[PDB]
Ligand binder design. Structure first.
Ligand code: CA
Ligand code: CA
Lengths: 251, 251
């Protein structure tokens, strides 16, 4: 029989799914501010279709962000999400009021302690190996309070092909055993095995079923690696020109 | 500025997207009748998630079916669609009251007259070539009032691999120049160039933009060939275990 709410539970990726930076939109296109930079100035935008879509979705369903952004970067997303969030590539769950989920934090700590030294080592070694190939890079360890989650690397050449090369050699030098990777645009991330949007969404669904039983679950994402959590949903969806959609086109 | 409605326009495939036959569900699964057979008895069903999902979508957006079913087979779909429909693989548009769109019918007649003799010929030749390979087949020409649209072929062996073989030889014998194909499950269809869900959805959008301007467009489909019309949408979506999703998994 029926228990709780029967409205869809919708997991949405953020960057390049609901909004994007100015460089990724045609100049002069009308836009609404969706995110701020660390200096507090607008830096991510929705075009009119994107704003209409997320407004409709937020009013019609229970919408939960599922994002690579860490908690601080998620706090610069200026969209009125009301159901909590999954952040840091599934390393963090936030309650509806934005406070940290202590249970998940404990479980993630358990999956990640064996990596706490390797992640700063791997970032420094990646940034050195890139400077040795002549590429001006930029990188850091993404970390919640205390706990280090994953390594991110970007390039300063206006040439995303650089990162695919670095990925090739790091893979060769064997530096990525026991880890998985995300690459989309000017972003190359190395993730420990127990860190994945899929794992956090799986737990979110386990909790939801105890309150609301089985209700429709929709997943929206733009990256090929978003297929991890999207495959847990009853239906999954992608923007027409996403990395995922372009790969499907080529198939 | 804003004109008309800003709710999403959602194009939905029908069979294996919103419902399916009993053979495609686990026995004993709870179900709701979605379609009737030609004898008027239930033959397609929604599971509880599917019923909740379409009910939510119909209440939340303007939902337009986009189906291979001809008008008569569409009339045996027992879902309360209120905005009209695209039928017969894009060969037919129906108004909200179910009457035929005369403009599109004229345009389709134009694209299809060069095929009116070839389609009965191609069906008969396919059913003969299959009987020559030892396969018990079944096939016919799908036709609206007067106008023949496309050829469909099914097998009676409980072995959908049969149809891929027939497709291989028909392709060899050159019988499919100027046409495109659909294959999913126990269904192999040969479509003239000017017959496609994509073309009808493209026209539906052209008409809608004059009334409602640019509003979010979502497309839902299960078949690889549904990517045609789904690529016209701002976002497209698919069931987790669809033919499309399985192909994406393999990629
Ligand atoms: Ca993204
Ligand atoms: Ca279908």
């Amino acid at each position: 029989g029926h228990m709780g709410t029967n409205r869809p539970l919708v997991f949405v990726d953020l960057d390049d799914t609901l909004f994007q930076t100015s460089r990724k939109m045609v100049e002069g296109t009308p836009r609404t501010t969706a995110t701020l930079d660390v200096h507090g100035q607008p830096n991510g935008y929705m075009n009119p279709i994107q704003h209409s879509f997320i407004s409709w979705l937020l009013a019609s369903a229970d919408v939960v962000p599922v994002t690579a952004r860490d908690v601080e970067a998620y706090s610069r997303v200026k969209l009125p999400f009301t159901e909590g969030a999954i952040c840091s590539h599934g390393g963090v769950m936030l309650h509806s009021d934005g406070s940290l989920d202590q249970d998940w934090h404990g479980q993630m700590a358990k999956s990640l302690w064996a990596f706490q030294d390797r992640l700063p080592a791997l970032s420094e070694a990646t940034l050195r190996i890139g400077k040795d190939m002549g590429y001006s890079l930029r990188g850091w360890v993404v970390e919640e309070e205390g706990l280090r989650h994953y390594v991110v690397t970007k390039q300063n050449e206006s040439d995303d092909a650089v990162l695919s090369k670095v990925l090739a050699e790091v893979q060769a030098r064997g530096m990525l055993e026991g880890m998985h990777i995300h690459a989309n645009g000017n972003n190359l991330a190395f993730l420990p095995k127990g860190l994945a949007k899929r794992l956090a969404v799986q737990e979110w669904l386990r909790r939801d079923a105890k309150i609301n039983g089985d209700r429709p679950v929709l997943g929206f994402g733009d990256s090929i690696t978003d297929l991890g959590f999207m495959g847990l949903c009853h239906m999954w969806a992608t923007p027409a020109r996403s990395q995922l959609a372009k790969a499907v086109e080529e198939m």
